[PDB]
């Protein structure tokens, strides 16, 4: 019996089989319907037909907000991508911490009542990433398309009072890039154009080590500019947008949020932990998720945490090269262990206890 | 947020510890562990926790990951047992081995009631405590190791 591991990101589904070193199916967590108002398309194929569809994400900031479309995503994952019968596979799902409890209750209900899985578990994403890095103690910064979260973990146990969450992540950065590109006279507005700008962001953006210095460099000459060919063949140029876009992670006021930036959420999380473990957290800051892939982000985090921390504190940022998939990989490892599977909810347990059982089994 | 309304409301609870203690009862490697002073060692082999024979204790394959349980009498009571649990990660170990070693270290900690203090020991970064476990000349690194448990997705 092979378990399935499905990391349902706000932006991307990562799905596959426990024991594999990578997800075999990675595709956009989108449902598309005709822009002019069968009847819908899912995932890669919706992306392929983007020219005629309006695209919608069923997960916003880590929370499922369109359950009918989420069911379409899960159905597509099992039957069209992985081509498995879900009733034959114990299934590991994932979630951001600090989600409302009803989200995993309904996940559990649909997995058992609609998909008839034999067993399932919902794991916290940051814990999977820490194990994927070979650690039991550290502080994870996970940033995807919907959520940025910090989870300090000591001896294998997440410290709930110190968990931090910011509902600011890759989708907000894409939207901000769309906005600032209007300053050059470009107009990216539609759901299809959002996906184009997402690609520009992924290919060309970076985190400046010193933002104000970089702004001056960009005005002094064209040395930082890059060009990009749109699907219609138009070639555009971008300059300081390359680094102003992810600067938002450090300065959330760029999009009108009063929140602390990611360097400050990380520091604040460490400071909520018992004094004697803080050195181990500072030395084990593990980054995971696609929004941690900007060139320069680890060096900027190192610099900013150094400025906040005690002057003698040893600080290390760990940035695994495959960190777009670290959550999934940690799930593949844990779901390969019989003792971890012993904790999973079985179909019989669900039949007898209902959705509330998820809170008593999944930690 | 509102922790009590959220999916982390039961973290840190007695219930979390109870469920994890139960899971740890399902690993054969822990049966009989930590019952007398000494050092017990296991190697991860394709996701499984496999005992290392005593005659090899102190010799570690650079390609592998291990769990080392050191049982000792604490200063507080010469007739009771306390524990340091070290997980040793060879310079060439693969991600599945190191992640399993980490998870299973927590599980052994659970099995022993939380008492073990955990130490992550990367080859070349071993702590003073780890270096003190083996008699002079006892700590030796060996070339090679067992094959990963992962299937490589092409
Ligand atoms: N090289 C890159 N540079 C910057 N952003 C990137 C890069 N690659 C991917 N991203 C962004 O990372 C996000 C997708 O990352 P991913 O970790 O799969 O998120 P997710 O798990 O779907 N979302 P979440 O629910 O927040 O965990 C999108 O916003 C991408 O545009
Ligand atoms: Ca090996
Ligand atoms: Ca312990
Ligand atoms: Mg994610």
PDB file of N, CA, C and O and ligand atoms in Angstrom, chain B residues 63-64 92-94 97 145-148, ligand 2:
ATOM      1  N   UNK B  63      27.956   8.006   4.314  1.00  0.00           N
ATOM      2  CA  UNK B  63      26.770   8.096   3.508  1.00  0.00           C
ATOM      3  C   UNK B  63      25.471   7.876   4.248  1.00  0.00           C
ATOM      4  O   UNK B  63      24.428   7.891   3.580  1.00  0.00           O
ATOM      5  N   UNK B  64      25.477   7.716   5.581  1.00  0.00           N
ATOM      6  CA  UNK B  64      24.312   7.261   6.325  1.00  0.00           C
ATOM      7  C   UNK B  64      23.976   8.181   7.497  1.00  0.00           C
ATOM      8  O   UNK B  64      24.745   9.071   7.867  1.00  0.00           O
ATOM      9  N   UNK B  92      27.538  12.629   3.448  1.00  0.00           N
ATOM     10  CA  UNK B  92      26.941  12.193   2.193  1.00  0.00           C
ATOM     11  C   UNK B  92      25.604  11.494   2.383  1.00  0.00           C
ATOM     12  O   UNK B  92      25.094  10.885   1.436  1.00  0.00           O
ATOM     13  N   UNK B  93      24.989  11.599   3.558  1.00  0.00           N
ATOM     14  CA  UNK B  93      23.683  10.985   3.722  1.00  0.00           C
ATOM     15  C   UNK B  93      22.647  11.686   2.844  1.00  0.00           C
ATOM     16  O   UNK B  93      22.749  12.873   2.546  1.00  0.00           O
ATOM     17  N   UNK B  94      21.630  10.943   2.447  1.00  0.00           N
ATOM     18  CA  UNK B  94      20.572  11.487   1.612  1.00  0.00           C
ATOM     19  C   UNK B  94      19.409  12.005   2.473  1.00  0.00           C
ATOM     20  O   UNK B  94      19.287  11.724   3.667  1.00  0.00           O
ATOM     21  N   UNK B  97      17.230   9.794   4.637  1.00  0.00           N
ATOM     22  CA  UNK B  97      17.870   9.215   5.810  1.00  0.00           C
ATOM     23  C   UNK B  97      17.929  10.231   6.939  1.00  0.00           C
ATOM     24  O   UNK B  97      17.608   9.917   8.091  1.00  0.00           O
ATOM     25  N   UNK B 145      28.008   3.729   2.278  1.00  0.00           N
ATOM     26  CA  UNK B 145      26.795   3.677   3.078  1.00  0.00           C
ATOM     27  C   UNK B 145      25.732   2.903   2.330  1.00  0.00           C
ATOM     28  O   UNK B 145      25.925   2.521   1.181  1.00  0.00           O
ATOM     29  N   UNK B 146      24.595   2.709   2.970  1.00  0.00           N
ATOM     30  CA  UNK B 146      23.467   2.018   2.359  1.00  0.00           C
ATOM     31  C   UNK B 146      22.685   2.937   1.427  1.00  0.00           C
ATOM     32  O   UNK B 146      22.656   4.168   1.584  1.00  0.00           O
ATOM     33  N   UNK B 147      22.012   2.327   0.461  1.00  0.00           N
ATOM     34  CA  UNK B 147      21.260   3.052  -0.547  1.00  0.00           C
ATOM     35  C   UNK B 147      20.051   3.775   0.031  1.00  0.00           C
ATOM     36  O   UNK B 147      19.345   3.261   0.910  1.00  0.00           O
ATOM     37  N   UNK B 148      19.794   4.957  -0.519  1.00  0.00           N
ATOM     38  CA  UNK B 148      18.609   5.733  -0.190  1.00  0.00           C
ATOM     39  C   UNK B 148      17.347   4.897  -0.277  1.00  0.00           C
ATOM     40  O   UNK B 148      17.231   4.018  -1.134  1.00  0.00           O
TER      41      UNK B 148
HETATM   42 CA1  LIG C   2      22.982   6.215   2.719  1.00  0.00          CA
END
